[PDB]
Amino acid sequence: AKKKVIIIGAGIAGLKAASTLHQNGIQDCLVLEARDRVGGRLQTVTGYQGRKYDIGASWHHDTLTNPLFLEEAQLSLNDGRTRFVFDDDNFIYIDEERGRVDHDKELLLEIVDNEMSKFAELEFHQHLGVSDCSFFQLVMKYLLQRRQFLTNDQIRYLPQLCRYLELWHGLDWKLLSAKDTYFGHQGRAAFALNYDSVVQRIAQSFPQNWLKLSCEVKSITREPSKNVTVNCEDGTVYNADYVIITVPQSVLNLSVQPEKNLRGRIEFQPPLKPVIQDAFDKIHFGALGKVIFEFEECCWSNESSKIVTLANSTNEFVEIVRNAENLDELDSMLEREDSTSVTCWSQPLFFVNLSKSTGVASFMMLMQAPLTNHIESIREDKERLFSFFQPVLNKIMKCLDSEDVIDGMRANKPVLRNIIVSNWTRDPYSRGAYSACFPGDDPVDMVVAMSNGQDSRIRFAGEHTIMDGAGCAYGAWESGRREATRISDLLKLE
Amino acid sequence: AKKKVIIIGAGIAGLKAASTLHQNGIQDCLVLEARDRVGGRLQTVTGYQGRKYDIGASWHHDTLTNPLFLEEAQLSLNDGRTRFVFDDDNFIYIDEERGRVDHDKELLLEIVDNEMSKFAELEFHQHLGVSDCSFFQLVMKYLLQRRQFLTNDQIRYLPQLCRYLELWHGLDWKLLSAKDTYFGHQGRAAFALNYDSVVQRIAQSFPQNWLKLSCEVKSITREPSKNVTVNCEDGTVYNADYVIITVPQSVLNLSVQPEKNLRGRIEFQPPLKPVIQDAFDKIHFGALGKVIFEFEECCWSNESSKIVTLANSTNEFVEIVRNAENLDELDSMLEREDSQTSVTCWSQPLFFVNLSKSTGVASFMMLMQAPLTNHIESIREDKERLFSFFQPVLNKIMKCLDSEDVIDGMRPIENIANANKPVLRNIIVSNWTRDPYSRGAYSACFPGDDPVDMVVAMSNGQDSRIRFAGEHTIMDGAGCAYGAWESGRREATRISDLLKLE
Ligand SMILES: Cc1cc2nc3c(=O)[nH]c(=O)nc-3n(C[C@H](O)[C@H](O)[C@H](O)COP(=O)(O)OP(=O)(O)OC[C@H]3O[C@@H](n4cnc5c(N)ncnc54)[C@H](O)[C@@H]3O)c2cc1C
Ligand SMILES: Cc1cc2nc3c(=O)[nH]c(=O)nc-3n(C[C@H](O)[C@H](O)[C@H](O)COP(=O)(O)OP(=O)(O)OC[C@H]3O[C@@H](n4cnc5c(N)ncnc54)[C@H](O)[C@@H]3O)c2cc1C
């Protein structure tokens, strides 16, 4: 029961940490995972007829700089096996009443969207001391400043188009920090085929007996006797020189709350430092969610792999923008316009057309908080799911030269065979999708507190513990490498 | 004759400087201009049937932050005049063999173009700075690094597509600094209608008797008796407390040469300070050119106002990229290919503005770059040769825009007319490379250039009395009309406040 290093969590951060420790000659380590599987928020599920889908992470982002992707790419150069596809495409944008709205010669929405993004960059990325605000408020500020140079249809539709950013963060635009909204992407993203192959390679790169599944860690204690004690729910006790904690930010947040009996919650003694505890006030957790619609066969146009459905907009909104004297006045007018039920048209949805990129007759749809929570709470009511998404699904088919969807879950018409829904908001070992900023948040606080450790022996890794690739699989992966490398170096000094 | 301020040059920098002096109550100033007109590199010309075109600057750039543009926009709110139109559009890209190549579900050229530009940003914004190279060299590196993630057609057409940036700098991709190639476009640009209204509104805002046209300044002397003496070509001598020199960088560059006989050259006594002379080695001058094609009427598709014809590309290039081991071998393989013809309309990218969609005028405004510009400008009076040169791209554009080949109807006596076909009526060409008072288009970076040196040396002045304004003297809006406008305001405000305080 005496270990060099114990890693809590077998997601990509934990797996890479173990892989790195082995690579550096470190022996007698343990990876403790609460689930009966490795991978954490990397999970590939099976659906209709053995079709595979990533229900967690699915893209390699930032392929110009992503060190994890580059490893996959180099392997692919050496054996010629396909591990990923570049599915970056020209976005189709769909409004309920107007239909297709992308690449329009009069609307030119993509062009004003870039100006909007330039506006956002200029608001923050030249200055210092600028107050943060919601993404919604930033768009309203843009419209107010540029209305003289925008058509009515541009004012109506542009705010709904730019909300695709909600699906980068997993948050509604009024919940989302403007300051953190517009980050740069370092090149195209590559769709993983699939992430389980990445997980399995890393998992196989260290001794297989290090791994302990179905092992929920319940407490971690530092005796002044240097060593760290790790208590598991099964009553097992371990003693380690070092400890790398990779549980999600959301699960870690449970430690600073009194209720002990929460699933996933780790009791720290001595308690997590105030800098760590206070950092939870300045960073939050988004809820990107996924729904997979599996069809019998593709009878729609494969013009694009990328399709976004726009939430409904109004002409009354345009009149309000043109008539408002200032931001404050704009806020008042929009409130009185507001004063129904959430539908599939209440928010933007991002649909990936897998038929074009992978040859599979399915759509992978991304949704955001607060929709994600409501949908995941009914993930087993398939009739109710179909009735909710039916209007957007039918509008999509229409715009893709096809016809209305037929419910075949129990000609050239699309037949829906199965629906798969994510569970991240309800799973106690993830409790949401990934770290995300509300207006006023400062992610650098958490990253600093996390990467400086609780003490020299108690360390942290994971998507929420690093700057580059923050929120992303490659950031989690790098953070794991980081902590293991540090510990490797300290261990050889003995 | 004794003057408070003498301004050399009546371009927008010089005009705004004079406007500013008058606005702040300064009297007895002079604007000495070598040409028989004001406006400098702002010039609106008249063509077929009274159609007007800006043959110099035509866009308000960076409309999010452009202070000249924002003043224009405020004026239109005030007086109901149309001064501009937003003509940013989705680019139509045309290759001679394949036809339209834009927004293509297989090629997706715009997407990898975006990636290349991100690659460029990453290349020159790491903490460790790197050596500059040509835009060409940068593009090749991208292809060599990213070939695993690019299809054959992407490798073939992308490098031709990206060369649209040649028409922003007025420079061939092998002549252009990669470091300065990708800069920030702060919002959409607005097409001016036209820049002559801008010139007239500033020109009319100071006393007309301040202006002296056809007045070439030949020397500027700072008497150790403290004032500045300005000598003109005709022999007229002037004395001033302050002088604002706004002649182009290309003309100012002549001052380091000894032969006084060079047209437009100004003799400085004492000579331009070493920090100024040295800055000329770290900045150069591009040659953006223009050709206007005027048609009888629009019989082409108005899907977009923005059209770019790509220079010819080969599948052989793709094979070379796929088979190269490193950068050195890639250069050798390309240089052999380059060794194994004449210059044509397909030897370089050309940027065509379709004025019919944005302005309702049945004409195209085409932009060209060095080395092509000076060659075309040299034959500007030979319409039939001009037509013959551009005929293949004009025809390819018409086909791609659902029309027919172009008819030469440039001679009125011939009574040429047609319904279905595009009838060319007139061709207008710029002359900025052969005009001694411009000698090119605007400041531009060769690889290794650092424009900061010139801007600093210019903004600090030759001394307290001898100041500089113009597009080449300012960081924000460098090269641009609004940079020149702001620089004029800058030097005049400085002098004006100084004079007020006495
Ligand atoms: C829907 C969705 C889509 C995403 N899309 C992308 C994408 O396209 N591209 C991308 O790069 N990233 C994406 N992400 C983000 C990415 O998945 C995360 O950044 C990354 O998976 C986080 O990995 P991690 O190792 O840091 O944490 P995890 O992968 O969650 O691993 C932490 C492990 O700790 C374990 N654990 C928790 N508590 C205990 C305990 N008490 N005792 C023992 N073990 C415990 C958990 O079981 C978990 O497996 C997406 C995420 C979601 C949810
Ligand atoms: C083809 C072309 C297209 C362009 N497109 C754009 C565009 O789209 N948008 C944009 O913002 N800018 C554009 N520009 C750049 C823009 O025109 C310049 O940045 C701006 O006009 C410079 O003005 P200036 O007053 O600084 O110099 P100028 O306008 O050249 O004025 C300097 C004056 O000095 C006078 N002079 C020279 N020598 C003497 C002398 N020896 N004695 C007395 N007077 C002398 C000259 O006659 C000249 O009129 C373009 C330029 C060209 C050439």
From Swiss-Prot, chain B:
Catalytic activity of the protein: spermine + O2 + H2O = 3-aminopropanal + spermidine + H2O2; spermidine + O2 + H2O = 3-aminopropanal + putrescine + H2O2; N(1)-acetylspermine + O2 + H2O = 3-acetamidopropanal + spermidine + H2O2; N(1)-acetylspermidine + O2 + H2O = 3-acetamidopropanal + putrescine + H2O2
| Statement: the UniProt record of this protein carries the keyword Oxidoreductase | yes
| GO terms for biological process, alphabetical | pantothenate biosynthetic process; spermine catabolic process
GO terms assigned for molecular function: N(1)-acetylpolyamine oxidase (3-acetamidopropanal-forming) activity; N8-acetylspermidine:oxygen oxidoreductase (propane-1,3-diamine-forming) activity; oxidoreductase activity; polyamine oxidase activity; spermine oxidase activity
- Top-level taxon: Eukaryota
Q: Which InterPro entries match?
A: Amino_oxidase, FAD/NAD-bd_sf, Flavin_monoamine_oxidase
Q: Which cofactor does it need?
A: FAD
Q: Say if the entry is tagged with keyword Flavoprotein.
A: yes
Give the keywords, sorted.
FAD, Flavoprotein, Oxidoreductase
Pfam families attached to this UniProt entry? Amino_oxidase (PF01593)
Per UniProt, the enzyme's principal EC class comes to oxidoreductase
TM segment ranges: none
Protein role: Involved in the production of beta-alanine, a precursor of pantothenic acid. Multicopy suppressor of fenpropimorph resistance.
**What is the protein's name according to its record?**
Polyamine oxidase FMS1
Species source reads Saccharomyces cerevisiae (strain ATCC 204508 / S288c)
